[PDB]
Design a protein around this ligand. Structure first.
Ligand code: DGT
Ligand code: CA
Ligand code: CA
Length: 326
DNA sequence: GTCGG
DNA sequence: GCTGATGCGC
DNA sequence: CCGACCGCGCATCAGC
């Protein structure tokens, strides 16, 4: 991290814009700049050097110059002092509490961990579980635990039906030595883009993982997406493992390559890749890549036989998962 | 906040 | 109930 | 200058 100081600064600014200003495009602008700088292989010496990078403009160059000279940003020092901004930024750290909800809470006088803990009845289900595991959810997961988690999930899914394929994606598939949480892509031959020849495909798998006490809470659950909480088994006399967030996504078997591209990320990589797709006259989602027509209407799904084919369509050289960590 | 048409 | 918008999250 | 900014699942709420 040659430029940690700068990218931390921009990340803080992005978070401010999302959580407090509720300015989602300013948030993405800061994130995009943060990401381009993070992969820049030189220690940056000026805002002018930075402004050469795409996504870094005048305003960010000016901030980078201030940060380099002093080591601080006045705009940020002030944000850190504002109690309302600080409270909103804190509350949004709870899963299920976003910028709108946080601001509502701050109005009602709820703005600390203690406040939340005595007002659970003011929280929806998701929020209540986010509060319950507030501390655990901020811890990262060593790849070594991610591997044990993978073994449990893969083996339990095999027991429900040997035809399931479960692939762990997210940062784990990108080779990270630690992950924020577990993301599992699931497929079954009974569920394709053409037919759903079997109901409860996701349910049954969630049920089995609850049965062995791996999954411990549900945040949300539909026919194709589960978001919840899980925990590794611990040994005799040892402290329990932290509770972890787990997402499970059931994707049509014939659309696996688009799905695994999506779920492997990173998020910024996906946003960048999809944006580029639009520039090349395609739209990409987790299911398909489709041509855009003159009218601007998504056409029919193009044939895809590998992750690489998606890269081919938009004239990108293939990038292995480990190089998609933007 | 940045950028391409 | 459904539909569409909005909030939140991936 | 200025329109456009990735794309979508689930939970919630208003309006009908
Ligand atoms: N298109 C798109 N895909 C996203 C977005 N956010 C997340 N994804 C996809 C790509 C991510 O790698 C994948 C899993 O999301 P996560 O929040 O778990 O992130 P990731 O595993 O990369 O990082 P982590 O180590 O868990 O903090 O979901 C998004 O905003 N847009
Ligand atoms: Ca993850
Ligand atoms: Ca996740």
């Amino acid at each position: 991290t040659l430029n940690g100081g700068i990218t931390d600064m921009l990340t803080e600014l992005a978070n401010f814009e999302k959580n407090v200003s509720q300015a989602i495009h300013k948030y993405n602008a800061y994130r995009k700049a943060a990401s381009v700088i993070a992969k820049y292989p030189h220690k940056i010496k000026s805002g002018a050097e930075a402004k050469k990078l795409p996504g870094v403009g005048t305003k960010i160059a000016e901030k980078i110059d201030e940060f380099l000279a002093t080591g601080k940003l006045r705009k940020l020092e002030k944000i850190r002092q504002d109690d309302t901004s600080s409270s909103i930024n804190f509350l949004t750290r709870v899963s299920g509490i976003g910028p709108s909800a946080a601001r509502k809470f701050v109005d009602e006088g709820i703005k600390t961990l203690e406040d939340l803990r005595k007002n659970e009845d003011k929280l929806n289900h998701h929020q209540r579980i986010g509060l319950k595991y507030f501390g655990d959810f901020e811890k990262r997961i060593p790849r070594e635990e991610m591997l044990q988690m993978q073994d449990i999930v893969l083996n339990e899914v095999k027991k429900v039906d040997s035809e399931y394929i479960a692939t762990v994606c997210g940062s784990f598939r990108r080779g990270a030595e630690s992950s924020g949480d577990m993301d599992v892509l699931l497929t079954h031959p009974s569920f394709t883009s053409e037919s759903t020849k079997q109901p409860k495909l996701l349910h049954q798998v969630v049920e089995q993982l609850q049965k062995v006490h791996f999954i411990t809470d549900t945040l949300s659950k539909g026919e194709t997406k589960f978001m919840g909480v899980c925990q590794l088994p611990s040994k005799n006399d040892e402290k329990e493992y932290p509770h972890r967030r787990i997402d499970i996504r059931l994707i049509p078997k014939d659309q696996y390559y688009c799905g695994v591209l999506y779920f492997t990320g990173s998020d910024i990589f996906n946003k960048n890749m999809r944006a580029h797709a639009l520039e090349k006259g395609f739209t990409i989602n987790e299911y398909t890549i489709r041509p855009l027509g003159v009218t601007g209407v998504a056409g029919e799904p193009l044939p895809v036989d590998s992750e690489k084919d998606i890269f081919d369509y938009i004239q990108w050289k293939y990038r292995e998962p480990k190089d998609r960590s933007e």
